[PDB]
Amino acid sequence: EAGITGTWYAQLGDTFIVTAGADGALTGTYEAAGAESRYVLTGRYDSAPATDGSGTALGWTVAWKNNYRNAHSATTWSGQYVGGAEARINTQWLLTSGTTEANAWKSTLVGHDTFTKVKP
Amino acid sequence: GITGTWYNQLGSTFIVTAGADGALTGTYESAVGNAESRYVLTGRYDSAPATDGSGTALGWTVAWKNNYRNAHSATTWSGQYVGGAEARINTQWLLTSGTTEANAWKSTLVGHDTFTKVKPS
Amino acid sequence: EAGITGTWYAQLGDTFIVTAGADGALTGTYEAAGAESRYVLTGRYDSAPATDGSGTALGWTVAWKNNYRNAHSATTWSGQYVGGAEARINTQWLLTSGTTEANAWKSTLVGHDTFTKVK
Amino acid sequence: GITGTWYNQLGSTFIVTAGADGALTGTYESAVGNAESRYVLTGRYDSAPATDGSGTALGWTVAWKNNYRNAHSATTWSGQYVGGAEARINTQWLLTSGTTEANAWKSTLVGHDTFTKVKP
Numbered sequence: 397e398a399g400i401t402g403t404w405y406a407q408l409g410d411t412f413i414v415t416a417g418a419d420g421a422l423t424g425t426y427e428a429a430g431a432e433s434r435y436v437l438t439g440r441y442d443s444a445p446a447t448d449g450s451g452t453a454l455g456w457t458v459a460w461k462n463n464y465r466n467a468h469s470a471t472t473w474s475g476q477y478v479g480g481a482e483a484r485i486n487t488q489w490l491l492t493s494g495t496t497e498a499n500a501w502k503s504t505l506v507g508h509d510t511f512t513k514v515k516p
Numbered sequence: 517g518i519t520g521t522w523y524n525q526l527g528s529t530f531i532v533t534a535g536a537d538g539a540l541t542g543t544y545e546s547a548v549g550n551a552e553s554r555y556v557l558t559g560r561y562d563s564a565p566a567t568d569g570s571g572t573a574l575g576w577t578v579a580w581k582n583n584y585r586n587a588h589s590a591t592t593w594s595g596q597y598v599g600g601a602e603a604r605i606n607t608q609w610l611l612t613s614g615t616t617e618a619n620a621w622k623s624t625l626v627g628h629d630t631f632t633k634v635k636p637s
Numbered sequence: 638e639a640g641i642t643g644t645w646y647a648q649l650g651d652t653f654i655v656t657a658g659a660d661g662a663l664t665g666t667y668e669a670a671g672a673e674s675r676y677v678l679t680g681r682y683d684s685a686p687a688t689d690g691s692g693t694a695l696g697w698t699v700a701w702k703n704n705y706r707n708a709h710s711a712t713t714w715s716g717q718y719v720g721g722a723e724a725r726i727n728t729q730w731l732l733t734s735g736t737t738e739a740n741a742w743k744s745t746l747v748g749h750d751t752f753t754k755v756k
Numbered sequence: 757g758i759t760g761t762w763y764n765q766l767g768s769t770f771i772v773t774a775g776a777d778g779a780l781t782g783t784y785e786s787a788v789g790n791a792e793s794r795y796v797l798t799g800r801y802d803s804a805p806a807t808d809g810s811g812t813a814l815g816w817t818v819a820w821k822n823n824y825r826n827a828h829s830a831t832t833w834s835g836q837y838v839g840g841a842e843a844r845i846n847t848q849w850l851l852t853s854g855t856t857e858a859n860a861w862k863s864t865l866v867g868h869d870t871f872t873k874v875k876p
Contacts, residue, residue, distance in 0.1 A: 408742070490747065491743075501649070501748055502746055502748075503748075504746060504747050504748065505742075505743055505745060505746055505747070506731065506745050506746070506747040507742055507743075507744075507745065
């Protein structure tokens with residue numbers, strides 16, 4: 397409380413580090429599976445979650461530009477943090493690429509990822 | 517182009533600032549849902565978009581807690597800014613509520629919002 | 638009287654023709670924007686909708702294979718029918734392409750489309 | 757390999773037949789939600805998939821009305837069949853409820869279900 401701050405691991409090797417601020421801020425760095433693969437992460441979480449067995453709602457964005465590379469796209473992850481011995485962040489995500497109007501219908505991928513505090 | 521006050525199709529107000537760096541900051545006031553007054557938002561955008569007529573990718577998050585209410589929820593919007601005569605931000609969103617594990621299957625709503633610098637209707 | 642049977646037009650050129658069966662069946666053809674561009678459509682709808690002003694829930698699928706082409710992908714539309722002078726079907730959709738596991742993370746596009754009875 | 761009885765991670769039962777012409781037919785019984793007993797499903801699949809190691813694209817719909825209950829809603833699953841050691845159907849789904857116009861923004865739930873021929 398909160399157990400969100402720290403390092404989180406996805407199934408296929410992505411890793412992020414985040415600080416959950418007392419004001420509801422999420423800030424950190426996302427590393428897609430060196431610094432060439434590291435991107436700024438910024439989001440928000442419920443800083444006063446229920447203590448009734450529910451998850452803690454959250455979301456964040458990564459725009460896939462850094463000093464080295466730029467995919468002209470951005471992912472947002474929406475989900476909840478589930479605490480305990482096997483804590484997890486369960487998310488669904490949208491990845492939108494910049495497109496022309498003609499190609500806008502195929503601008504956005506949807507998917508899901510779970511993150512854990514230990515490597516899977 | 518992104519910095520300014522935007523309105524979605526339902527009348528919600530999105531006041532955003534785009535930093536030189538890729539940062540989005542601002543406030544969101546929803547016209548619908550378990551929400552009242554302004555909420556903080558943060559996000560990111562592509563600060564060096566392509567020069568081929570493509571839009572500018574972006575996204576942001578609102579956690580639906582402020583000094584007055586808490587819905588134990590958060591929405592993320594993912595989309596692109598399209599400049600021109602009439603600038604638009606076209607998005608799809610995910611709204612996740614805290615749930616127990618048994619109810620996690622019904623935790624997340626999906627939708628689509630289009631933002632313009634004029635109020636709707 | 639479901640009001641669904643007939644021809645529907647998407648905002649960007651696509652057309653479909655559907656029959657709403659008394660039992661909840663949707664059956665028809667989707668033409669993408671031309672038999673080369675026509676595909677089988679099948680789905681289901683709520684044949685006894687609420688009478689409180691709510692729309693009529695429905696969904697359908699098109700696999701993008703016909704006798705001429707195969708994109709190795711399928712779209713599902715999930716939405717609701719709203720009747721009246723300006724009847725419409727408001728949908729959100731998921732398009733999944735067959736991929737290897739390594740590429741599964743980019744298998745599925747999401748979007749939305751509204752269909753009307755006039756172009 | 758699609759024809760058969762499948763279960764998702766919640767214990768829902770998906771009984772499906774794949775027709776030579778690309779048709780999917782069968783029944784769905786949900787372990788969760790406003791649902792009782794079997795519901796009719798129909799859908800489509802790619803009857804001539806790639807041979808390059810890709811999965812087989814498919815989708816289906818259930819309207820949540822049967823002779824017992826009506827939830828005024830429909831779910832569509834969009835995904836792919838992955839033949840493997842243990843065969844799997846990986847999906848994402850959209851559940852839309854009939855709503856008034858004022859509530860249309862909250863009409864649609866999204867999630868992801870994985871189906872195997874084994875029940876959890």
